[PDB]
Amino acid sequence: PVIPLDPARRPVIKAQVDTQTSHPKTIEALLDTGADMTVIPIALFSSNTPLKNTSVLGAGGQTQDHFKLTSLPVLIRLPFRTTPIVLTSCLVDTKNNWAIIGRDALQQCQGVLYLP
């Protein structure tokens, strides 16, 4: 669909995320064209699964141990599309449990920005 943009309403969407370590869960993610890579909360994972250290830039700088990478791909189903998005890897937020859909996922839906 078409999602209007409003400073006062964040463009969010309900997504089913399968990390391949639990059963798939539904979360509400921000649609973010300024994010290179998708971010999902660690609350989706079982406490045993391994992750990798990583780096990423942010508004107050870049962090060291805040965000981790998944070892296995992550599958994402959106309400409209029937087939899942498959990300080779994406970021895991261990602190704030942010959920953000980035340009890696938006390219696989062939998403676009449109400015009239």
Place this chain on the structure above:
Amino acid sequence: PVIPLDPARRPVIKAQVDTQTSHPKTIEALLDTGADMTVIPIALFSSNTPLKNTSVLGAGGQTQDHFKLTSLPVLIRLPFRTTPIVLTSCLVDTKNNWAIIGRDALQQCQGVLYLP
């Protein structure tokens, strides 16, 4: 126009920004649906103009004295428009030198996200 979304290429636009404290400058800005409010580099303002303190969200927490707020409105002109976007207030980046067009400005352009 249509701006395709690609994890490897940041979606940027060229925008003329008028702080009303110096002469207008054309800069390169990121188009960011995940930003509530537009961010402007402090380099576009006068060394004498007054700014106000405030808070912001961002990857890795929130920062106190990294961003300030403008005291005067900011005007923004796009390539395909001569009528200026008018932001009654927007954020100022005192360090990192980010230029981000957020949803406050995208609303006045009538910009939308489209997911097929």
